């Protein structure tokens, strides 16, 4: 989902490694703020949920990313269409579990609901 290793190590680390460093176009700074902001908000979410958050935020996974999963998920075509038209519900029934962080890589697992039973007649009972 994000390559900070490539940007930092290939564009910044060689500069900062030296005694006197220079930054010319300030736009460079803003582009770094943009890329780095997503990391900071994901880190903040985990620190207040001990690595278990629900629902799954747009910080954890954008809708473009989630549908790439749902389309590539090992589920039935009906399940695909069901989840896709109601993704915000899938978010609420999902958990984002922080896993590990080593070897210049950060990883966390996302638990997704898969609906094995669909379109059976449901009914709600009110009592008083």
């Amino acid at each position, epitope marked *: 989902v994000l390559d900070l290793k490539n940007y930092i190590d*290939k564009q910044l680390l*060689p500069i900062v490694n030296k*005694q*006197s*460093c*220079s930054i010319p176009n300030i736009e460079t700074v803003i582009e770094f703020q943009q890329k780095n902001n997503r990391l900071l908000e994901i880190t903040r979410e985990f620190s207040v949920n001990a690595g278990v958050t629900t629902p799954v935020s747009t910080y954890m996974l954008t809708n473009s990313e989630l549908l790439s999963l749902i389309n590539d998920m090992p589920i039935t075509n009906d399940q695909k269409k069901l989840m896709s038209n109601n993704v915000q519900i899938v978010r609420q029934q999902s958990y984002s579990i922080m896993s590990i962080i080593k070897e210049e890589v950060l990883a966390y697992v996302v638990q997704l609901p898969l609906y094995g039973v669909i379109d059976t007649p449901c009914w709600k009972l009110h009592t008083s």
Partner: antibody, heavy 124, light 109 residues
Framework: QVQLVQSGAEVKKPGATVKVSCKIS????????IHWVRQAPGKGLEWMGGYEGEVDEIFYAQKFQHRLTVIADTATDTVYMELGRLTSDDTAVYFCGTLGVTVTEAGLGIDDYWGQGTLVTVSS | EIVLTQSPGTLSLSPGERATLSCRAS???????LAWYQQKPGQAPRLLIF???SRATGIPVRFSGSGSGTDFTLTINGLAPEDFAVYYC?????????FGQGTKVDFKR
């Protein structure tokens, strides 16, 4: 505290060969650049060659490419220079410095570390 | 064959006045690869500015560089006593470095 230490003063007769070292303390060689520039007494500065630890590539000035050799030992964090076929025109002071210019889209970076200078006198 | 020129050869000015030093090249050099160094008698060179308009760490703000293409200029806004020395401009291209002959700075006495 990064410091560069050069070899002592040397005197060599015409036609001989002279070796000057440049020892690095407080920093690794593989992440720095090390170049040799000489100064004849009372004259300007003249580039000779250099070493780029970032790429492990050596550069020579075409004026001395045929008779100058530069060696870098990464294990000792030391750079040596050797110029042969010495004549009275080679009598000068020799320095090692970090002229390496790092270029990225985001900006530039450079080190500025120098030795104390090495007096080399060539005469018969 | 990259050739560098500096004007004047010797400049004499009083402390507190502005020193303007020129550096001109026989051909176009990349601005990132240009640098300016200062040398006092008996010392190794010190790097002042590099990439035209970028001061090194710890260099006072009174020093400022500018230039492009073939003509480059180091400007000192208000000469300090410790500024009276020799000033070399340094070009580089394809990691082939080339030094100017240097401009000497003198006390206007």
């Amino acid at each position: 505290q990064v410091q560069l230490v050069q070899s002592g003063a040397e005197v060599k007769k015409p036609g001989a060969t002279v070796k000057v070292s440049c020892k690095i303390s407080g920093h690794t060689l593989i992440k720095l650049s090390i170049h040799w520039v000489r100064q004849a007494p009372g004259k300007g500065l003249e580039w000779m060659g250099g070493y780029e630890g970032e790429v492990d590539e050596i550069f020579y000035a075409q004026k001395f490419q045929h008779r100058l050799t530069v060696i870098a030992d990464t294990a000792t964090d030391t750079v040596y220079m050797e110029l042969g076929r010495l004549t009275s025109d080679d009598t000068a002071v020799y320095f090692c410095g970090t002229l390496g210019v790092t270029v990225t889209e985001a900006g530039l970076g450079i080190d500025d570390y120098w030795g104390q200078g090495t007096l080399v006198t060539v005469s018969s | 064959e990259i050739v560098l020129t500096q004007s004047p050869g010797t400049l004499s000015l009083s402390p507190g006045e502005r020193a303007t030093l020129s550096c001109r090249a026989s051909q176009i050099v990349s601005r990132n690869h240009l640098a300016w160094y200062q040398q006092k008698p008996g010392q190794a060179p010190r790097l002042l500015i590099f990439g035209a308009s970028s001061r090194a760490t710890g260099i006072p703000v009174r020093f400022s560089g500018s230039g492009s293409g073939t003509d480059f200029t180091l400007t000192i806004n208000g000469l300090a006593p410790e500024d009276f020395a020799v000033y070399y401009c340094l070009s580089s291209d394809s990691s082939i470095f080339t030094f100017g002959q240097g401009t000497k700075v003198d006390f206007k006495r």
